[PDB]
Design a protein around this ligand. Sequence first.
Ligand SMILES: *[C@@H]1O[C@H](CO)[C@@H](O[C@@H]2O[C@H](CO)[C@@H](O[C@@H]3O[C@H](CO)[C@@H](O)[C@H](O[C@H]4O[C@H](CO)[C@@H](O)[C@H](O)[C@@H]4O[C@H]4O[C@H](CO)[C@@H](O)[C@H](O)[C@@H]4O)[C@@H]3O)[C@H](O)[C@H]2NC(C)=O)[C@H](O)[C@H]1NC(C)=O
Ligand SMILES: *[C@@H]1O[C@H](CO)[C@@H](O[C@@H]2O[C@H](CO)[C@@H](O)[C@H](O)[C@H]2NC(C)=O)[C@H](O)[C@H]1NC(C)=O
Ligand SMILES: *[C@@H]1O[C@H](CO)[C@@H](O[C@@H]2O[C@H](CO)[C@@H](O)[C@H](O)[C@H]2NC(C)=O)[C@H](O)[C@H]1NC(C)=O
Ligand SMILES: *[C@@H]1O[C@H](CO)[C@@H](O[C@@H]2O[C@H](CO)[C@@H](O)[C@H](O)[C@H]2NC(C)=O)[C@H](O)[C@H]1NC(C)=O
Ligand SMILES: *[C@@H]1O[C@H](CO)[C@@H](O[C@@H]2O[C@H](CO)[C@@H](O)[C@H](O)[C@H]2NC(C)=O)[C@H](O)[C@H]1NC(C)=O
Ligand SMILES: *[C@@H]1O[C@H](CO)[C@@H](O[C@@H]2O[C@H](CO)[C@@H](O)[C@H](O)[C@H]2NC(C)=O)[C@H](O)[C@H]1NC(C)=O
Ligand SMILES: *[C@@H]1O[C@H](CO)[C@@H](O[C@@H]2O[C@H](CO)[C@@H](O)[C@H](O)[C@H]2NC(C)=O)[C@H](O)[C@H]1NC(C)=O
Ligand SMILES: *[C@@H]1O[C@H](CO)[C@@H](O[C@@H]2O[C@H](CO)[C@@H](O)[C@H](O)[C@H]2NC(C)=O)[C@H](O)[C@H]1NC(C)=O
Ligand SMILES: *[C@@H]1O[C@H](CO)[C@@H](O[C@@H]2O[C@H](CO)[C@@H](O)[C@H](O)[C@H]2NC(C)=O)[C@H](O)[C@H]1NC(C)=O
Ligand SMILES: *[C@@H]1O[C@H](CO)[C@@H](O[C@@H]2O[C@H](CO)[C@@H](O)[C@H](O)[C@H]2NC(C)=O)[C@H](O)[C@H]1NC(C)=O
Ligand SMILES: *[C@@H]1O[C@H](CO)[C@@H](O[C@@H]2O[C@H](CO)[C@@H](O)[C@H](O)[C@H]2NC(C)=O)[C@H](O)[C@H]1NC(C)=O
Ligand SMILES: *[C@@H]1O[C@H](CO)[C@@H](O[C@@H]2O[C@H](CO)[C@@H](O)[C@H](O)[C@H]2NC(C)=O)[C@H](O)[C@H]1NC(C)=O
Ligand SMILES: *[C@@H]1O[C@H](CO)[C@@H](O)[C@H](O)[C@H]1NC(C)=O
Ligand SMILES: *[C@@H]1O[C@H](CO)[C@@H](O)[C@H](O)[C@H]1NC(C)=O
Ligand SMILES: *[C@@H]1O[C@H](CO)[C@@H](O)[C@H](O)[C@H]1NC(C)=O
Ligand SMILES: *[C@@H]1O[C@H](CO)[C@@H](O)[C@H](O)[C@H]1NC(C)=O
Ligand SMILES: *[C@@H]1O[C@H](CO)[C@@H](O)[C@H](O)[C@H]1NC(C)=O
Ligand SMILES: *[C@@H]1O[C@H](CO)[C@@H](O)[C@H](O)[C@H]1NC(C)=O
Ligand SMILES: *[C@@H]1O[C@H](CO)[C@@H](O)[C@H](O)[C@H]1NC(C)=O
Lengths: 59, 441, 48, 36, 130, 130, 130
Amino acid sequence: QVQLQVSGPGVVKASETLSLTCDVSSASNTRDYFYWSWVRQSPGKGLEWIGGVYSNSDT
Amino acid sequence: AENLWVTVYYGVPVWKDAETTLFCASDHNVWATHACVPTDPNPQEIHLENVTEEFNMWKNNMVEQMHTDIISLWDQSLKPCVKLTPLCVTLQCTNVTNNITDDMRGELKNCSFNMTTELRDKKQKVYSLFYRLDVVQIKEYRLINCNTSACTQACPKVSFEPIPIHYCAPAGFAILKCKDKKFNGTGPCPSVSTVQCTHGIKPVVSTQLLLNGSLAEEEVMIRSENITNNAKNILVQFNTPVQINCTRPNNNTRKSIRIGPGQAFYATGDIIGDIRQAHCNVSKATWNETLGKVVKQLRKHFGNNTIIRFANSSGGDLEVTTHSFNCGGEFFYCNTSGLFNSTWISNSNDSITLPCRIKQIINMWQRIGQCMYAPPIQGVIRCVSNITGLILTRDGGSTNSTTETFRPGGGDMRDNWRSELYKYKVVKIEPLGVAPTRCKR
Amino acid sequence: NPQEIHLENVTEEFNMWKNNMVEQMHTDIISLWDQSLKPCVKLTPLCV
Amino acid sequence: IKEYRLINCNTSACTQACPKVSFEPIPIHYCAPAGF
Amino acid sequence: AVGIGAVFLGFLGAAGSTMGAASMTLTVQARNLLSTVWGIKQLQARVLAVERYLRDQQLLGIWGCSGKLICCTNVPWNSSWSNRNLSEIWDNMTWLQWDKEISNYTQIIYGLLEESQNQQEKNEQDLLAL
Amino acid sequence: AVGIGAVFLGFLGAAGSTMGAASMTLTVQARNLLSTVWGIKQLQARVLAVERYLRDQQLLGIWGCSGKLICCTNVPWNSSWSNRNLSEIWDNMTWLQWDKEISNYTQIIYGLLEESQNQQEKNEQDLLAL
Amino acid sequence: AVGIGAVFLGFLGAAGSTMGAASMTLTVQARNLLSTVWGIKQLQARVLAVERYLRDQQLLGIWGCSGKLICCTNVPWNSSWSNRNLSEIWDNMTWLQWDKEISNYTQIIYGLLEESQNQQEKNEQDLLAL
Ligand SMILES: *[C@@H]1O[C@H](CO)[C@@H](O[C@@H]2O[C@H](CO)[C@@H](O[C@@H]3O[C@H](CO)[C@@H](O)[C@H](O[C@H]4O[C@H](CO)[C@@H](O)[C@H](O)[C@@H]4O[C@H]4O[C@H](CO)[C@@H](O)[C@H](O)[C@@H]4O)[C@@H]3O)[C@H](O)[C@H]2NC(C)=O)[C@H](O)[C@H]1NC(C)=O
Ligand SMILES: *[C@@H]1O[C@H](CO)[C@@H](O[C@@H]2O[C@H](CO)[C@@H](O)[C@H](O)[C@H]2NC(C)=O)[C@H](O)[C@H]1NC(C)=O
Ligand SMILES: *[C@@H]1O[C@H](CO)[C@@H](O[C@@H]2O[C@H](CO)[C@@H](O)[C@H](O)[C@H]2NC(C)=O)[C@H](O)[C@H]1NC(C)=O
Ligand SMILES: *[C@@H]1O[C@H](CO)[C@@H](O[C@@H]2O[C@H](CO)[C@@H](O)[C@H](O)[C@H]2NC(C)=O)[C@H](O)[C@H]1NC(C)=O
Ligand SMILES: *[C@@H]1O[C@H](CO)[C@@H](O[C@@H]2O[C@H](CO)[C@@H](O)[C@H](O)[C@H]2NC(C)=O)[C@H](O)[C@H]1NC(C)=O
Ligand SMILES: *[C@@H]1O[C@H](CO)[C@@H](O[C@@H]2O[C@H](CO)[C@@H](O)[C@H](O)[C@H]2NC(C)=O)[C@H](O)[C@H]1NC(C)=O
Ligand SMILES: *[C@@H]1O[C@H](CO)[C@@H](O[C@@H]2O[C@H](CO)[C@@H](O)[C@H](O)[C@H]2NC(C)=O)[C@H](O)[C@H]1NC(C)=O
Ligand SMILES: *[C@@H]1O[C@H](CO)[C@@H](O[C@@H]2O[C@H](CO)[C@@H](O)[C@H](O)[C@H]2NC(C)=O)[C@H](O)[C@H]1NC(C)=O
Ligand SMILES: *[C@@H]1O[C@H](CO)[C@@H](O[C@@H]2O[C@H](CO)[C@@H](O)[C@H](O)[C@H]2NC(C)=O)[C@H](O)[C@H]1NC(C)=O
Ligand SMILES: *[C@@H]1O[C@H](CO)[C@@H](O[C@@H]2O[C@H](CO)[C@@H](O)[C@H](O)[C@H]2NC(C)=O)[C@H](O)[C@H]1NC(C)=O
Ligand SMILES: *[C@@H]1O[C@H](CO)[C@@H](O[C@@H]2O[C@H](CO)[C@@H](O)[C@H](O)[C@H]2NC(C)=O)[C@H](O)[C@H]1NC(C)=O
Ligand SMILES: *[C@@H]1O[C@H](CO)[C@@H](O[C@@H]2O[C@H](CO)[C@@H](O)[C@H](O)[C@H]2NC(C)=O)[C@H](O)[C@H]1NC(C)=O
Ligand SMILES: *[C@@H]1O[C@H](CO)[C@@H](O)[C@H](O)[C@H]1NC(C)=O
Ligand SMILES: *[C@@H]1O[C@H](CO)[C@@H](O)[C@H](O)[C@H]1NC(C)=O
Ligand SMILES: *[C@@H]1O[C@H](CO)[C@@H](O)[C@H](O)[C@H]1NC(C)=O
Ligand SMILES: *[C@@H]1O[C@H](CO)[C@@H](O)[C@H](O)[C@H]1NC(C)=O
Ligand SMILES: *[C@@H]1O[C@H](CO)[C@@H](O)[C@H](O)[C@H]1NC(C)=O
Ligand SMILES: *[C@@H]1O[C@H](CO)[C@@H](O)[C@H](O)[C@H]1NC(C)=O
Ligand SMILES: *[C@@H]1O[C@H](CO)[C@@H](O)[C@H](O)[C@H]1NC(C)=O
């Protein structure tokens, strides 16, 4: 089963660059491409889709 | 007007039950993992959707294979070690009364004896401390095993600590794992997957209490080949563990004497300080709530209005009558009278202490004529374990009374392996099939 | 008649100090010596 | 220990060499299986 | 249906699928058929796997289907073995149920395939002479 | 030819030669790939050789290239695996260097090859259905 | 004779029959070629059986006769090997007498078939090159 772990700074100053890293651990070694994406939800608001990328191409 | 012809398909996903030899994989020890194929870093577990498979824990060949493998490994480990044939002699034994408590009166015997040396023509007068369960009076005493067979001393280097063992099938064979929770161990399983190897199963040897095992993910599980049959053992799996702290507080001193050319016998010289009985502590509240969960689960099988009581063990040998196990080399037998002693009505920091007796002459498997001597462990010893399950037996079974009596069980280590291999089965793949199709050669 | 072949146009990296053949030969020789010494007398009573 | 003992006695027992077994080295060719 | 990847099933992921769906994963199952207390056991397991694989390959060869995952044959399918039509065979059941159903007639089909292959070989030899 | 010797090409003789020249000497490699303490290890040596040869034969078979030295396949060559030109590889590189270059793409190529072989088998079945 | 039934010969029933008649039972003989100290002896026996079976399979393969019970070859039949006609061979004597007769000319014939198949595969590769 694919497992995802997120990491990054808990506090970032205003007008700076926020860097987040999500690592992927997959138990299957055969060649497979997933579609990864980032989704943020503000406190008390609905979810928002930031962006995504393929796991085998720069698209 | 059909015109259907045979077509051969190679590689169809078909399997059926089979018996094979599963080989070991692991990440000086009694369980030889040096010869096992190292486990893959990322095990492959493929879920079989739309697959319902019949499982049966009580007729699984994996349990028999694991039992035979464990006995073979034990024999291999004991093969290159000293044989205590000269140890069978007349012993002049006195009572150990130096700094001992009232509960330890007569348990230890200070025994002096003549013994061989490096040279065949020389003898040495030596002394040792022997547990009361190990010596039988002929002041004249002899080891208990002398009139049965010789004993092979356990080598001090090999460690008795269990190591996880993964069982893997060869090519052309598959291992099916039942992922369905709340599983009885017998019948259909709709949630089934296939694994190249089983999970790490530590070969823990224990009676009346499954230690360092696997926990149920939802609630306490009751399993039995025939629950209505009082002669069938009941396997109970806890959803949460119960911490048990087992300790021998004696500061045992090991002295090694030369008994021959390159042969050393490790005796217990003296206990440094006070002498007191080894014992096991278990939290009272945790045990009470676990017993309540077990009672509520058993009520589903034996009726909501029945009376459930936990009582003595029936009787027999010390291995079955008491909770037998090992704690870092020293072999403990603990009187589990305070645990299974209560009744339940269908309406703090203190802990329960179980006294324990240490033994050196041992018989792990149900065999006669093959014994082992456990060298003493230097100093105090303590261990912490997870009680994750129970082996129970139902007494009587008459319908005259509404009460049900459950007693601790054990003795057969096949049940211990069954509690871990209940969800696993082995099948052989059949890639050849014939089907009807309109295609023609 | 041993059959040798020249690998023309070939270059290969060797390392005698990490060759598995040496360890295999050592193990085989030890096993042979252990085998040869099994079926004859052991001089246990000689220690006097 | 005039009194003497074999050096190996306090280490381990000794196995007498088989008398008819020769210690002459013989050439050995270490040959791999097929595919090697 | 725009942001999506692709993951392919494993060794037996197609077991619960229909026959038609499972017929595309034959190679996945095929490739996995070949790959002192623990030594002799492993050696015997390897020998047993080799023997089983070679037995299956020999059966395929004597049926004239050597080196073919799917191979049509000249043996007709009579209604005695199975009265079920193709519509409910390749779209309403899996291969395990098929093995359960026609386990009794497997040897008869195998013998008929062997005899058909022998007859085909003899006919080919006779035709090739001309 | 009266006065003439016999230069028998050797095993792995064209290892250092270019791929184009080395592809002409596949036979000398392929023809002989199968052929108390000593006997016990001779046994497992034989078993290892047999199982290696059988796995190679199975891999050849599941790609539809059984009993062949050069097998043309239907899967296209993805340029991402190697951007080098045909004349570059077939005249300025050896087989060993090629193996080192594409050592990390062998599994994907093998999977595509077996999938294409399965698709070809299905297409042949459909063609024979008419 | 109406109402007779049928029973088919077993492993070596056609041993003493004519070669033409014995050629119908190739599959029956073919299927029977594969199926502590005594453990070692049995392992040696079965491993050697597997090795012999693979030897036979590869010997057939190096002639291009893979998977074929009856396989025709381009090697002409030299007269000195046997001056008997087809009628006297296929209808008046068995396979055992045949093998006894051609025991002297077995290896040379095998080499001839081997080189013929080598030439054939070389020609096929050359033709497919264009
Ligand atoms: C359930 O699991 C738990 C947790 O894993 C188990 O509890 C562990 O038990 C092990 C051993 O049973 C214990 O490890 C020992 O701890 C001691 C403190 O560190 C050490 O004394 C000891 O090391 C000695 O023994 C090893 C062999 O066991 C040797 O390799 C090592 O060199 C040491 O031996 C030297 O010292 C002794 C004593 O002087 C001497 O006789 C020797 O000759 C040598 O000089 C072990 O490391 C863990 O600490 C325990 N963990 C916990 C949390 O309690 C529990 O036993 C399991 N239950 C069951 C039933 O299996
Ligand atoms: C067990 O007995 C031995 C011998 O009978 C005791 O060892 C003696 O100890 C006393 C007091 O320390 C010494 O004076 C003697 O010289 C010792 N004798 C020998 C032969 O060693 C030993 O103390 C006893 N142990 C226990 C626990 O009672
Ligand atoms: C060790 O051996 C000695 C010598 O045999 C034993 O001492 C003998 O004991 C017997 C029986 O009591 C007497 O008849 C002898 O006279 C004793 N001989 C000597 C030299 O003392 C001694 O008892 C043995 N020790 C043990 C612990 O069994
Ligand atoms: C006893 O049980 C506890 C509780 O289940 C175990 O602690 C777990 O250890 C595992 C190690 O694989 C961790 O993943 C879990 O997160 C732990 N859980 C908790 C609640 O701490 C403990 O390891 C067990 N000990 C033994 C010896 O079996
Ligand atoms: C479970 O055990 C019970 C009790 O033995 C079995 O029922 C008994 O079956 C025998 C068969 O001869 C009868 O003589 C007894 O009278 C039955 N006793 C009761 C209480 O029913 C029962 O068959 C067993 N179940 C299974 C599935 O084997
Ligand atoms: C088991 O519990 C008993 C008490 O029920 C413990 O005995 C205490 O041990 C501590 C050691 O920290 C001493 O300070 C106390 O004086 C002891 N009290 C009594 C009444 O004996 C015992 O140590 C516990 N053992 C384990 C292994 O946890
Ligand atoms: C068994 O021993 C463990 C320590 O190994 C005990 O855990 C302690 O529990 C007390 C609560 O009474 C806590 O204050 C301590 O911090 C715990 N210690 C550790 C190291 O976590 C446990 O209580 C003991 N159990 C029994 C039944 O005696
Ligand atoms: C069963 O429980 C009883 C009482 O709780 C125990 O019986 C005692 O056994 C000892 C030793 O045989 C006798 O000296 C006592 O007189 C018995 N008491 C009674 C009231 O009968 C018995 O030990 C327990 N069984 C086990 C295995 O611990
Ligand atoms: C296990 O523990 C119980 C509880 O202490 C023991 O039963 C006691 O036995 C003694 C005899 O030595 C009696 O005096 C007590 O009255 C008994 N207590 C109870 C509560 O019944 C039992 O004997 C122990 N088992 C063994 C095998 O020693
Ligand atoms: C498991 O079975 C279900 C149905 O039992 C399959 O879902 C069907 O898929 C087919 C074609 O793929 C559709 O025509 C049906 O309408 C679907 N049924 C339902 C109820 O949705 C499902 O694909 C099977 N899973 C696998 C992995 O083969
Ligand atoms: C090793 O390299 C040499 C040259 O470096 C190869 O010889 C070349 O062969 C080709 C094709 O026959 C000719 O076109 C070249 O002119 C040759 N070069 C020279 C310098 O003579 C040689 O073939 C390679 N080795 C092997 C075994 O193929
Ligand atoms: C065994 O041999 C006999 C005689 O050698 C065979 O009988 C001949 O059968 C053929 C046709 O099969 C006839 O043309 C001949 O006239 C028969 N000869 C005689 C003398 O009867 C018989 O067929 C052989 N049987 C087998 C099973 O090989
Ligand atoms: C040793 O103590 C036990 C238990 O108290 C007693 O039965 C025995 O008679 C004693 N033996 C002696 C003093 O020799
Ligand atoms: C050995 O002796 C004990 C007690 O002395 C007895 O119970 C046991 O049956 C004896 N065993 C044999 C094999 O004689
Ligand atoms: C588990 O097995 C028992 C024993 O036959 C059966 O009666 C019960 O229905 C099974 N339980 C489940 C949940 O399948
Ligand atoms: C046991 O005795 C030894 C030697 O006297 C000492 O070093 C050690 O600390 C003692 N251990 C305990 C737990 O008292
Ligand atoms: C026991 O009580 C529960 C309610 O707590 C009830 O659902 C259950 O059915 C009862 N058990 C039986 C066997 O009827
Ligand atoms: C068993 O429980 C009873 C109360 O029912 C109590 O009096 C007795 O002491 C208990 N025995 C043990 C050994 O815990
Ligand atoms: C054996 O004795 C020799 C000479 O007395 C001594 O050097 C050696 O250390 C001893 N070895 C052992 C294992 O006692």
